[PDB]
Design a protein around this ligand. Structure first.
Ligand SMILES: [Cl-]
Ligand SMILES: [Cl-]
Ligand SMILES: [Mg+2]
Length: 278
């Protein structure tokens, strides 16, 4: 009797944080398409637990999932080893890293960050605050936007102000703290523009600036990132970089379903959405 491996009908999707509306939207878009194809979905989050990635991968290795889509990566080499044992079954999307053995979709965030910063320079801005959810320094993956910022400053012969760099800032509440610090500065030490890397962060930064009677954008311009659902509804509607959630979700899910043998074989752009905040 020849016994062939039987599909579980379960797929894992990993995000950093589901209370980040960008990740919620990306998750929804992927999960609904998987669901429509008859799959159930395991979700995990890594924002407060790097170990969550290994636990997630163990579910694939132990044959409880048919495949996984990762929208964030902790340890590329660990994901790689799993991908090589599970060809066609590991897909990485929008994680600012390419994983050998896994179909990896990398979006042009270096380019988008350069373009957004050039937009700000062209509006007359010269002193820049830069906020990131990652660290300011490091040789690890996930640094494309920070390198774009540094390269931008070099190209326009602008000196980086180390006091205007804010690392490990992810949420609106953390943004409020950044904004309060910026509003505290003497007009001549204050940044002209803030690159927030997050619409959640931007909403918080703006709230604190306005609370201190600092005008946005007239005194300080604030650039968001993602074009999240609340962005057009913000107190100062957000100028922001638009992530193509629906298109990247469709691409990632297609790559996985092709790998699982369910679909037959058949460019993702970041753009700048201009509103009021910058
Ligand atoms: Cl990416
Ligand atoms: Cl986040
Ligand atoms: Mg100005």
């Amino acid at each position: 009797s020849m016994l062939r491996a039987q599909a579980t009908g379960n797929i894992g999707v990993l995000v950093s944080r589901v209370t980040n509306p960008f990740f919620a939207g990306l998750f929804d878009a992927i999960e609904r398409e998987l669901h429509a194809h008859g799959y159930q979905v395991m979700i995990t989050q890594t924002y407060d637990d790097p170990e969550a990635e290994e636990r997630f991968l163990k579910q694939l290795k132990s044959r409880e999932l048919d495949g996984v889509i990762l929208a964030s990566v902790e340890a590329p080499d660990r994901v790689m080893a799993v991908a090589k044992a599970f060809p066609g079954r590991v897909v990485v999307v929008n994680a600012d890293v390419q994983i050998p053995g896994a179909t990896s979709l990398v979006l042009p965030h270096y380019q988008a960050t350069r373009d957004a910063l050039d937009y700000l320079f062209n509006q007359g801005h010269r002193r820049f605050a830069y906020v990131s959810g990652g660290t300011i320094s490091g040789a690890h993956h996930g640094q494309s936007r920070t390198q774009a910022f540094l390269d931008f400053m070099q190209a326009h012969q602008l000196l980086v102000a180390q006091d205007l760099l804010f690392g490990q800032i992810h949420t609106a509440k953390e943004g409020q703290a950044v904004g309060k610090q910026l509003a505290s500065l003497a007009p001549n030490v204050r940044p002209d523009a803030v690159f927030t890397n997050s619409d959640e962060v931007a909403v918080g930064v703006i709230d604190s600036l306005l609370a201190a009677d600092v005008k946005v954008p007239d005194d300080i311009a604030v650039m968001g990132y993602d074009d999240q659902p609340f962005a057009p509804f913000a107190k100062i509607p957000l100028t922001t970089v638009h992530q193509p959630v629906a298109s990247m979700a469709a691409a990632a899910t297609h790559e996985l379903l092709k790998g699982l043998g369910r679909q037959v074989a058949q460019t993702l752009h970041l753009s700048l959405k201009i509103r009021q905040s910058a």
